[PDB]
């Protein structure tokens, strides 16, 4: 079991790094892929890449060895880098939802409203918020619990548990996950709602001659919308539920499960290349990039 658990982590890192390198390559190397949407995809892929290179590997060791080998400074920097890259990833998924909703439902308004320079500000904002929730609290010790047993792990350099106070775990969870999850629901719900109301206007048009049914395109669009919300939710909702649970009755949920769910969340970063880069132009670039 601990033989196969370790091998599994390895390919997680392989899938993340490969996938996100392949994406960033494709976008930078293809004139046709440098669209406005793919600008936000580039932000996403950067976040997930840093997850694959630095965040997951150092985390993989802490499971294998059962202790932190690189001393108190790097514990806190790695922790910041983790929170930063997760926050950027998830908040960027949320920006993409918004973007696509506008470009599908108000395409002409969206072209004038959403300039390339406006997109850059949105992107930079997302990383600023991600920094200010991770690096600023974590490096400045605002996250720290006052407990004695918590203060033992802070003084031990072999211990790199992420024990936070009440306030930080609430705020950090809301900012990194819950606000984005609500936005992503609201927004993608108005895509479903818009498409259903549009089919009503088509049946009203017919003067009772036809009633429309879900065709190939409509089932496929609903499957996509499901994958987007399903995979994201599956991957991060368990961890972020449990993270809020620990703020109340910390004994209730085991530590091995808390960590197991944090790995499920890292796995999202391997999924995002697969979900968000299926365009015919991406497919062409990927084959060109693999000689």
């Amino acid at each position, epitope marked *: 079991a601990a033989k196969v658990m370790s091998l599994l982590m390895a390919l997680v890192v392989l899938l993340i790094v490969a996938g996100n390198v392949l994406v960033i390559a494709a976008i930078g190397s293809t004139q046709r892929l440098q669209t406005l949407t793919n600008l936000f995809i580039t932000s996403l892929a950067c976040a997930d890449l840093v997850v694959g290179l630095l965040v997951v590997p150092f985390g993989a060791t802490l499971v294998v060895r059962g202790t932190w080998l690189w001393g108190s400074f790097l514990c806190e920097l790695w922790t910041s880098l983790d929170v930063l890259c997760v926050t950027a990833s998830i908040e960027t998924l949320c920006v993409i939802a918004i973007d696509r909703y506008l470009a599908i439902t108000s395409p002409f308004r969206y072209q004038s409203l959403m300039t390339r320079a406006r997109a850059k500000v949105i992107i930079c904002t997302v990383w600023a918020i991600s920094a200010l929730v991770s690096f600023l609290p974590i490096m400045m010790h605002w996250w720290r619990d006052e407990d004695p047993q918590a203060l033992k792990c802070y003084q031990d350099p072999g211990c790199c548990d992420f024990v936070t106070n009440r306030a930080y775990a609430i705020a950090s969870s809301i900012i990194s996950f819950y606000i984005p999850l609500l936005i992503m629901i609201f927004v993608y719900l108005r895509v479903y709602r818009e498409a259903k109301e*549009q089919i009503r206007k088509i049946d009203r048009a*017919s003067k009772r001659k036809t009633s429309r049914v879900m065709a190939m395109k409509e089932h496929k669009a609903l499957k996509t919308l499901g994958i987007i919300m399903g995979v994201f939710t599956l991957c991060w909702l368990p961890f972020f539920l449990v993270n809020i649970v620990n703020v109340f009755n910390r004994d209730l949920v085991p530590d091995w499960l808390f960590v197991a769910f944090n790995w499920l969340g890292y796995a999202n970063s391997a999924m995002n290349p697969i979900i968000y880069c299926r365009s015919p132009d991406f497919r062409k670039a990927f084959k060109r990039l693999l000689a």
Partner: nanobody
Amino acid sequence: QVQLQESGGGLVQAGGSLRLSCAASGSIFALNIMGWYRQAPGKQRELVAAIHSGGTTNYANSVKGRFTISRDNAANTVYLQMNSLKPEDTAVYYCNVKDFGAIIYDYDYWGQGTQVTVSS
């Protein structure tokens, strides 16, 4: 299979009128843009007019006020009513459907094209 069937073009006197029509047969996602582009001889293809499933429109400057785009509420069919034609408007006109059914990206369908020639 999706296919776009263009009609209504041809030859016409300057100051006259034409009514292009493009009938999109096949599965198209409810949310989309049907449009008309054109390509005058030895030039690049440009947008003439476009209409979202929603009802919003978008025109080029050259044709603003003269041309009006509309769509059949029932079927996937789009009409470009071209009035006050000038020799400048002479081009191969292409019907286009931007399909949004993939959500993250759009799929494009183009028509074969139909000649419009406006003599003075």
